[PDB]
Symmetry: D2
């Protein structure tokens, strides 16, 4: 009798057992969801990580920069969940920005980072909306980019683009009766900038614990936020609401 | 086996069965919560309405402008739930702006604006001050908001009161955090509640019609259930790292220009 | 000058450290003809580069508000109208800001604070719009209240209300071809502000206010000088000029860019 | 006495006399600024347009996707303004998004090659321009870019809105770098400017979006007139907003502050 009982959910972005996607997958299974997982490049390595989850789940290859992987994705998911079944949820937990810092980054690096971290949220929704049920939910991972900060410079730019992409994805998803939202998380250990979060957060922030973030994603995947779309839910201990 | 199984929750703001608080109370009870209800002024009338809820719940009087009601509130709640028990949730679903403030903008006297701000914004801090000493860690305080980031033809001073409420919520979160309690607002789209000239109504109509147009998933102003479900999500253990914040239950209308 | 020939009303002078004193000085240096309002002040306004009539205005006094336009018309001469209005008025009792806990502020104190700091922006616009020329500009003073901070408490709440009031004032002002905007300044060492740094409110809160102030210069990409009100006064004069003609119901940040940076 | 008397300002983005950059250049010259102009691809065509400005100004070639143009830019500007002189202002009025990413094409049908080109020209180039020109800018200087409020999604604008969201973030980082030189960096978010071609259905949607602007704006909005936008850019180039950086100034009639 779980929050996601009977729901079929695709979870992308597992690379290690410290991945936010690993914790999202674990919490979703504990809550009764039937998962389909996607991985990039190191598929044998990813499969061994997915064996650590409480329940067995099929693992599909997905390089978001590969148009052939995107064109075949819905058919491959349909084979995994069975003909006649559709997804109730999609989790985008993918991000990358080449190490290149701000003025020295060539455009080839920035473009690759934006492709993977922002444009792919639209690519995944385009591929999967035709196999999603009404009342469905698409959730992506964000970090608040409204202010510039030292380090993560071009990744912050990619998150600003992702927030805008999410608002357009919501317009398309709405046609299918599907919601689209981002979870803006505080820093997770997957220094001064990081320590400031626990200081600002009225309820504190534990950088070593991804469970509050995973629970927030599951709340959006559930039927309990049915009138929220094109939006951002902050799972950051309330740090973004406080100056000092 | 409900979302709020075993939780003790105080719900303020029921006046009619169309009240957002009525729907919040109904959904919470369906989800296993044990409620304590508070009403203002028309207590006999409110008891007849709360008799329509799926389960029995004690009804306490609370006028948020009455300092004696606020000073005695925690003791009265403790008596209703039993000594040794504490609340897990608090719902503030209270708002009022006298007619003059809702040239309506320039003609509203300060006495009217001050009363509206007292009831709609300051009282969120008053309720938290009174109830935090009787709230359990992991607890949740939720208030009702209407997005006031942009001015709109009608609502005028009520919009100003909501801007003040959003700021109050951020300070309440600082205090609530000391008790391991979250404080958040639900910004709802327009709902056809009881209280909700020619121009005023025409402005509301256009505002209301644009909302459903702008919302990617649409907006039904006759249905308070999506709003009630969102409040219950915040009262649950499923948004444990969210505080001093605003969750929008508006069909996504605020995220779209046209 | 930037404001050559403009007739501008400036409220909020109490000392020569008042932001309004600096706004008035820069405006006169830029060729504006001023009318001043105060709630002792005549001895301070005598320190400005040019002579200007001083009118009494208690924003909580409805008789002062009802007679204001007539009194301004008498000061500037029949047939003349105002081009600009500056609201540089703010108040919150010590129970609502400083060392007092957020929950311990009584509503009577908060309400007086909101009346003076937010509602009066609408009162002033109501009284003066009938005597303002098209292309006119109303400017108010703000402190970014988007995030909660220590000590500022109910004054931050009053600023959140002021920002909302400004958006509604812009709707009304637009009917007269007048703009309405706020300048959100960084912290300025005015009369009360220097005392807190000195230790007037104690060690614990004095350190917290000092950290809040020091972080500003650290976050600001161009730095922030708390001792200098001139960049703020110049920003207000930019809004009073004809150089931001399509900006209304808005907020211009004169804070060194601190609000755009997290660390 | 002009607002920009004696200031040396670089203005990019002129293609036609309807370009926002044309109006920025005109107002800056009327206010006493000495300009250096940059143009892309159609240099002969751009020269005929810049001949319509009140004063003569050198025109330099600048393709923001060309790293050799960027590497030589500061040296070429120094030659145009004279050795020992530096710039007081820089105007970025450059934007591009292929028809696959903006217009009638569904949001999901824009290929990444087209989106990436659009982001390179419309957002990344703001950082490229600042990197090339900050070493030849005076303290108290000002870098200004053109923006269109992307905080809410809207029909047709699609990936150009995404590019503007990226530009706003780029501006905040450029301000951190510019601050080291005592230089400000800001964007001007303008309302729509007229700078059946796309069909009935989309043509009506774009028209409704445009008409709502004048309705929302408390002081109205004239889509035919770039002068209020050009004046706002000149205010940021002046010494009158000295404590504003990493920020956005809205020259949109106040439309973004009103719901209806
Ligand atoms: N860790 C934090 O502090 C934090 C905070 C807020 C948001 N986030 C976001 O959460 C998400 C997950 O990050 P994480 O912290 O779990 O790190 P992670 O390194 O564990 O996950 C990033 C994932 O992206 C995948 N990926 C990279 N290139 C890809 C491609 N071409 N195709 C498909 N997938 C690709 C990687 O394989 C990996 O699984 C990202 O969007 C990240 O920006 C992280
Ligand atoms: N209806 C909408 O369109 C809408 C939209 C967004 C948010 N909200 C908010 O939701 C909340 C509830 O509104 P509603 O639409 O259910 O209206 P409602 O009329 O049903 O409820 C308002 C409640 O406030 C109570 N109240 C007024 N003065 C009080 C006082 N002095 N002490 C205690 N209680 C007092 C009333 O008794 C009533 O129960 C309010 O905060 C309102 O601003 C409403
Ligand atoms: N750090 C700062 O000092 C700071 C930062 C940002 C914004 N501001 C704002 O700038 C404005 C001016 O503040 P200041 O720092 O110059 O301090 P100040 O004390 O010099 O000015 C406040 C003024 O408000 C006037 N006032 C108070 N009650 C009044 C009433 N009933 N009627 C009319 N006038 C009344 C006082 O006479 C005084 O002239 C305020 O809005 C303030 O919040 C100040
Ligand atoms: N027109 C509007 O409604 C509107 C509204 C808000 C903001 N803006 C922005 O104002 C700016 C100017 O646009 P406009 O409306 O004047 O249109 P425009 O077509 O007149 O100007 C765009 C300019 O970008 C230049 N450009 C394109 N590719 C380039 C490259 N590779 N290298 C260098 N320059 C290149 C073009 O040559 C042209 O001069 C853009 O950033 C645009 O997004 C326009
Ligand atoms: C004069 N106009 C209003 O204030 C409308 N309004 C109300 O009047 C609410 C209200 C209901 C009942 C009482 N009451 C008196 C005695 C016992 N109960 C008091 C107040 C509500 C206020 C809250 N709501 C909204 C509606 C839109 C935006 C924000 N808030 C719904 C209408
Ligand atoms: Mg209009």
């Amino acid at each position: 009798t779980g929050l996601l009982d009977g729901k079929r959910i695709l979870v992308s972005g597992i690379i290690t057992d410290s991945s936010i996607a690993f914790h999202i997958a674990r919490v979703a299974q504990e809550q009764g969801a039937q998962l389909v997982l996607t991985g990039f490049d190191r598929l044998r390595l990813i499969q061994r990580i997915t064996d650590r989850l409480p329940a067995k789940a099929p693992l599909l290859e997905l390089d978001v920069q590969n148009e052939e992987h995107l064109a075949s994705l819905a058919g491959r998911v349909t084979e995994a969940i069975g003909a006649g079944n559709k997804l109730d949820g999609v989790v985008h937990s993918i991000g990358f920005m080449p190490q290149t810092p701000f003025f020295d980054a060539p455009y080839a690096d920035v473009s690759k980072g934006i492709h993977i971290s922002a444009y792919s949220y639209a690519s995944m929704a385009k591929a999967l909306l035709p196999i999603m049920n009404p009342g469905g939910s698409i959730v992506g991972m964000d970090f608040d980019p409204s202010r510039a900060m030292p380090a993560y410079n071009w990744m912050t730019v990619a998150k600003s683009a992702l927030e805008s992409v999410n608002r357009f994805v919501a317009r398309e998803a709405g046609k299918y009766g599907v919601r689209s939202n981002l979870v803006a998380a505080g820093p997770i250990r997957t220094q001064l900038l990081e320590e400031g979060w626990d200081q600002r957060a009225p309820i504190g922030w534990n950088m070593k614990d991804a469970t509050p973030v995973a629970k927030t994603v599951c709340a959006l995947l559930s039927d309990w936020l049915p009138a929220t779309t094109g939006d951002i839910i902050y799972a950051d201990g309330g740090a973004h609401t406080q100056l000092l």
